[PDB]
Every structure is written in C-alpha cells, then in structure tokens.
Structure 1
C-alpha cells in the first residue's frame, strides 16, 4: 500500500484541483493525506476516505500570520509568509507522518501546489519526492518563461492593440494586464518556476488537445516529466466548496428551455466597484436573455452582498444567488453560455461541459486564458474593454442566439467531445494518468 500527501494552497481555485487529483489518485489505489492550513479549510466530513492534518497556522498563531485578514486581496499574504517561514514545521509534520507509517505502508511522494516552492528543499531533505500541481494553463506558463523577452521589449514597464513579439496569439494589452503588478509578484514567480523545474514531476490541469501549441515549451523548459489530466472530466469539485451551495437554482433551471440561460460568475476572489456592478446588471437585462448570476458576498466593494440593486431590477428573466455547485450548473441542459472572469478552473469546467463563454478578466492569468479561448480555440467572445451595457448585451446575444455565433457554439461542443475522447483508452489524458500512476508507484 502506498500513501500520497497533498498540500494545497488554501484558496478555492487551488483547493479544488488538488482535491480532484487526490480523488483520482485514491481511485487508483493510493491512500491520501491532506496537509492544510486551518485558514479556508474545506469540510473534512465530506472526505471520510482522506486523512486531514492541519498545519502552519495552528494555535497559537504566528505574529507573522496572526490577525492577517481572512478575506480580501490581502488574505493572500499568507502565501509568501508560509514559503518564507514554514519549512521547519512542514519537515516536522512530514517526518511525524513518515514515522507513524504502517510497516506495509510507504509514503510515495508529496504533491504540492506549485506556489509552495519552499516545499522542494523540505522534501529533498527527507529523501521524499515532490511533484507539483499547476493550477493554471500551459499557455500561461509559456508566457511566464517569456517574461525576459517581454521585459526587453518594454511590455512590462507601464501599442496596446498590437500583436506581441513572440505571441501573435497575444496583444501587448494582454501582457500588461497579466503582469500589471510585477515588482511585487516577480519574486514569487521566479521561485515557483525554479522549484517547479527542480521537482520530480509536474501535473497540469489541462489536456493535450486543449493546449497543443504549448506542449513543446513545457517539454523543453521543465526537465521533470509532465502529465496533463483534465480534472473536471473525472469529477466535479463540489465536495471542496468553501461556501454553502444554493441548490434552489436547479428547480429554476428545470423551468427553462434548453440552452436558454446565461450563467454568470466571476470566481472566488474577484471584487468590483459599485459602478461596474450596476453596469453589468444593466447589460444582463439589456441582453433580454435569461440569466443566473452568482454574486459572491464581498464581490461588490462597500456592500455586504447586493444592496445597490433596486428590488426587482433583474425582473422576470434573471436570478442572483451567492454560490452554486458551478460545474453541475454548467452541465444543466438549460445553460447556453457562461460569462466568466476567465479563472482557469472555471474556464476548464466550461470547456469540459461544452459551454461557450463570454470573457471578462481581473488580471494575472485571466486575460491570457480569455485571449487563448477566444482567438485560438474560438469558444467565446472577449469583452476586453471594460464594462459597457451595450457591448455586454451584444456579446451575450452573439454567443447564445445570433446565427453569426453558431461556429462558437459548435466549437464548444466539439472541444467537450475532444476532452471526452482524451479520457478513453488510447487518449492523451488516459495515457497521462496511466503514466502518472506507474511513475508514482516507481518512487
């Protein structure tokens, strides 16, 4: 019997793929331990088949992380802090577990979020192999390793509509938005890349037919073996939700005609002005399409939830809720399109359920996902110039109703089929997973 320890980053878009992976590996016969912070912990009672061990922010909490905000853009400060100071505790916890191991039980490897770059030297020091889970795309990684070239050209220092030097796929505007903050994130980025290259293997939440153009860069830049597995095609992330689901939406979805509903959601951490929030609502109403709009409490700066919205303003066609089982909604027959912030989990979920998209973005990898999805794969329309009700209504109707958008709807259907075929024997994802299991078993 072989045990795998997995160590996620404690945010929704990082906990979801690592617990999907944990379940996949469990299905292949591995026992599973999850190392996790108390902060943003998932519901351990949803995982009776996993062992959870809480680390790094136990009582008494550190002056470095104590009273750090549990929500907002500053909650992420925990990441660099744990990278800089958690090595000794992580080693102690790994040793404790390796000591408590049953005689017939071996710890095969540690799998961490790529953001936990500090974990490589910890694993090395224990003669424990470390594999890395990337929670972003191969295309985004290709952009990462092109930063030096981008910097030479001055893209990173603030011709926007112009094609980038080595990315005809990208506009200079995309790169500026993606690396808008860079003196701040440059240091994290370099260390993550360096310790990913130094790892024993890299697992990508993707599939070959999704990012074929990006495979050679990964093979050339990362000496460790890479494995591409589209985790949403194996299972949804419902069990790792950090918020309660509103499942009353499914009775409502059951009252809608096929492909008639726009699903709208901007992920787990995004926030918008009161002004932009109201413009989005007017664009949705103006589209005349039915819509289901997830507005996470905290999404609107200065309001607990959705106070600025007039009572009944959404009217007949629209519903607003706080949180749903997103991939399950995307799989419902009523959904015709997905207005996304282009987070990678949401984008891959939509691809895997065959739902075409309208893209907004909040920086980081999101503009790159939106550009790649909209111009390379051609499964959506990118609202790349802010929020204006007219352009919003036109984009929604183009994807969902216009005859001119049929090719986008068809591309989304075909791309889902490619994902499905990739999981069949002889498919790319099937062979990646087979290779991953045999590789881990050889450690």
Structure 2
C-alpha cells in the first residue's frame, strides 16, 4: 500500500486541479493525504476518503503572514512568504507523517503545485521524490522559456499587431499583456521553473491533442518525465468549491431551449471598473441572447457586488448569480457558449464539455490561452481590444447564432470528442495516466 501527499496552493484555480488529481490517484489505489493551509481550506467533510493536515498558518499565526487580507490581490502574498519561510515546518510535517507510517505503508511521493518551489529542497532532504502539478498550459510554459528571446526584442520593456519573431502563434501585444509585470513576478517565475525542471516528474492538466505543438518543448526543456491528464474529463471540481453553489440555476436552465444560453464568468479573482462592468452588461443585453452571468462579490470596483445595475435591467433573458458549479453548468444542454476570462481551468472545462468560447483576459497566462484557443484550435472568438458594447454583441452572436460561426461550434464539438477519445484505451491521456501510476509505484 502506498500513500501520496499533495500540497496545493490555497486558491480556487489551484485547489481544484490538485484535488481532481488526488481523486484520480485514489481511484488507482493510492491513499491520499492533503497538506493545506487553514486559509482558503476546502470543505474537508466533502473528502471522507482523504486525510487533511493543516500546516503553515496554524495559530499562533506568524507575524509575516498574520494580518494578511483573506481576499483581493494582496491575499497572494502568502505564496512568496511561504516559499521563503515555510521549509522548516514542511520538513517537520513530512517527517512526522513518514514516521507514523504503517509498517505495510510507504509514502511514495509528494505532489505540489509548481508554485511551491521551496518544496523541492525539502523533499530532497528527506529522500522523498517530488512531482509537480502545473495548473497552466504547455503553451504558456513554452512562452515562459522563450522570454530571453522576448527580452532581447524589448517585448518585455514597454508594433503590437505583428506576430512575434520567436512565436508565430502569438502577437507582440499578447506578450506585452502576459508579461506586463516582469520586475515583480520574474523572481518567483524563475525559481518555479528551476525547481520544476529539477523535480522527479511533471503532471500537466491538458491532453496531447489539445497542445500537440508544445510537446517537444516540454520534452526538451524538462528532463523529468511529463504526463498530460485532462482532469475535468475525469471529474468535476464541484467538491473543492470554496463558495456555496447557487443550484437554483439548473431549474432556470431547464426552461431554456438547447444551446440558447451564454454562460459568463471571469473567474475567481478578476476585478473590473464600475465603468467596464456596465459596458459588458449593455453588451450582453445588446446581443439579445439569454445569459447566465456569474459576478463574484467584489468583481466590481466601488461596489460590494452589483449595485450599479438598475433593478430589472437584465430583464427577461438574463440572470446574475454569485457562484455555480461551473463545469456542471457548462455540461447543461441549454449552454451555447461561454464568455470566459481564459483562466486555464475554465478554458479546459469548456473544451472538455464542447462549449465554444468568447475570450477576454486579465493578463498573466490568460491572453496566451485566448490566443491559442482562438487562432490555433479555433474554438472561440477573442475580444482582444477592451470592452465595447458593440463588439461584444457581434462576437456573442457569431459564436451562438451566426451561420458564419458554425465552424467554431463544430470545432468545439470535435475537440471535446478528442478529449473523450484520449481517455479511451490506447488514447494519449489513458497511456499517460497508466505511465504516471506505474512510475509513482516504482518510486
């Protein structure tokens, strides 16, 4: 019998894939321990088959992380702080668990978010193999490792619409948006890459037929074995939701004709102007399509939730809610399209449910995902120039209704079919999971 310890980053887009992976590995016969902060902890009662151990921010909470806001952009300061200072405690917790191990039980490996680069030297010091879960795409990584060529060209130092000389698949404007914050994030990024290369294995939330152009880069740049597993095709992340679901949406979805509803969501941490929020809204009302919008409290700047919106503005065709089981909504027959911020989990969920997309972005990997999806795979339309009520209306209608958008809708159906085929025997994802289990078992 073999145990795997998994250590996620405590944010929705990072907890979701790591607990999907944990469930996949449990289904293959491993026992599971989750090391987690108290901050943003998921509902442990949803996981009776996992053992949770809460670490790093137990009371008395430390002076370096105590006082930190639980919401907003500053909540992410916990990540560099834990990387810088958490090694001693992580080692103690791993050793305690390895000690209490049953006689017939061995800890096979530690799997961490790639962002926990500090865990490599900790695992090394215990003779414990560490594997890394990437929560972003292979294409994004390929763009990472190409930054030197980008740096020389001054792309990183603020000709927007031409293709990048290194990357034909990207525009210069994409690269400028993705790496707008290079002084600040550059340090974390380099160490994350270095310790991912130095790990014992890299698990990617993707599949070969989604990112075939990128496989050779990962083989060449990362000496450790890579595994591609499309986690949403195995199970949804419903059980790791950090917020209560509004399931009243499914009764409303059941009142809509097939493929008639635009699902709209900009993720778990994006935020917008009071100006932009009302323009998007008019863009939705203008498209004349039915829509289900998820607006996270605080998504709006200056408002607690949605106060700028006049009572009844959405009228007959629109509903706004705070939070849903997103992949389950995307699977509903009423959904015709997904207007997304292009976060990687959302993008992959939509791909796995065969839903074509309209793309916005808020930087980081998001513009790269939108570019790849829209121009390589051609499963959506990219709103790559801000929020205009007009342009929004046309993109929505092009994907949902226009005969001219039929190829985008068909591409999304075919790509979902490829995801499904990949989990079949002899499929790429099946073989990658088979390889991952036997590899972990050999450790």
Counterpart-to-counterpart distance in 1, 2:180 and 2:187 = 14
The DSSP-based 3-state class of the residue aligned with 1:74 is: helix
Superposed structure 1 runs of 4+ greater than 6 Å apart: none
Match of 1:87 in 2: 87
Deviation per CA, 1:122-147: give whole Å up to 9, x if none: 00000000000000000000000000
Counterpart-to-counterpart distance in 1, 2:299 and 2:99 = 45
What is the Cα deviation at residue 301 of structure 1?
Answer: 1.2
Unaligned regions of 5+ residues in structure 1, if any? none
Counterpart-to-counterpart distance in 1, 2:215 and 2:384 = 27
Deviation per CA, 1:303-359: give whole Å up to 9, x if none: 111000000000000000000000000000000000000000000000000000000
Aligned ranges 1:6-405 → 2 under 5 Å: 6-405=6-405
Counterpart-to-counterpart distance in 2, 1:304 and 1:127 = 49
Counterpart-to-counterpart distance in 2, 1:280 and 1:16 = 28
Counterpart-to-counterpart distance in 1, 2:313 and 2:391 = 20
Counterpart-to-counterpart distance in 2, 1:305 and 1:46 = 28
Counterpart-to-counterpart distance in 1, 2:165 and 2:245 = 44
Counterpart-to-counterpart distance in 2, 1:162 and 1:63 = 48
Unaligned regions of 5+ residues in structure 2, if any? none
What is the Cα deviation at residue 166 of structure 1?
Answer: 1.3
What is the Cα deviation at residue 369 of structure 1?
Answer: 0.1
Counterpart-to-counterpart distance in 2, 1:60 and 1:276 = 42
TM-score norm. by structure 2 comes to: 1.00
The DSSP-based 3-state class of the residue aligned with 2:111 is: strand
Deviation per CA, 1:7-31: give whole Å up to 9, x if none: 0000000000000000000000000
Counterpart-to-counterpart distance in 1, 2:397 and 2:58 = 50
What is the Cα deviation at residue 155 of structure 1?
Answer: 0.1
Counterpart-to-counterpart distance in 1, 2:68 and 2:329 = 34
The DSSP-based 3-state class of the residue aligned with 1:155 is: coil
The DSSP-based 3-state class of the residue aligned with 1:184 is: helix
Deviation per CA, 1:405-432: give whole Å up to 9, x if none: 0000000000000000000000000000
Deviation per CA, 1:262-315: give whole Å up to 9, x if none: 000000000001000000000000000000000011111111110000000000
What is the Cα deviation at residue 395 of structure 1?
Answer: 0.3
Counterpart-to-counterpart distance in 2, 1:274 and 1:11 = 25
Counterpart-to-counterpart distance in 2, 1:104 and 1:121 = 27
Deviation per CA, 1:186-241: give whole Å up to 9, x if none: 00000000000000000000000000000000000000000000000000000000
Counterpart-to-counterpart distance in 2, 1:144 and 1:223 = 16
Counterpart-to-counterpart distance in 2, 1:310 and 1:107 = 56
Counterpart-to-counterpart distance in 1, 2:368 and 2:135 = 14
Counterpart-to-counterpart distance in 1, 2:384 and 2:58 = 43
Counterpart-to-counterpart distance in 1, 2:403 and 2:329 = 25
Counterpart-to-counterpart distance in 2, 1:52 and 1:237 = 17
Counterpart-to-counterpart distance in 2, 1:210 and 1:274 = 36
TM-score norm. by structure 1 comes to: 1.00
The DSSP-based 3-state class of the residue aligned with 1:185 is: helix
Counterpart-to-counterpart distance in 2, 1:164 and 1:359 = 21
Counterpart-to-counterpart distance in 1, 2:110 and 2:298 = 34
RMSD (Å) for aligned C-alpha atoms:
0.3
What is the Cα deviation at residue 118 of structure 1?
Answer: 0.1
Counterpart-to-counterpart distance in 2, 1:78 and 1:301 = 23
Counterpart-to-counterpart distance in 2, 1:236 and 1:212 = 24
Counterpart-to-counterpart distance in 2, 1:182 and 1:348 = 26
Counterpart-to-counterpart distance in 1, 2:201 and 2:430 = 17
What is the Cα deviation at residue 167 of structure 1?
Answer: 1.0
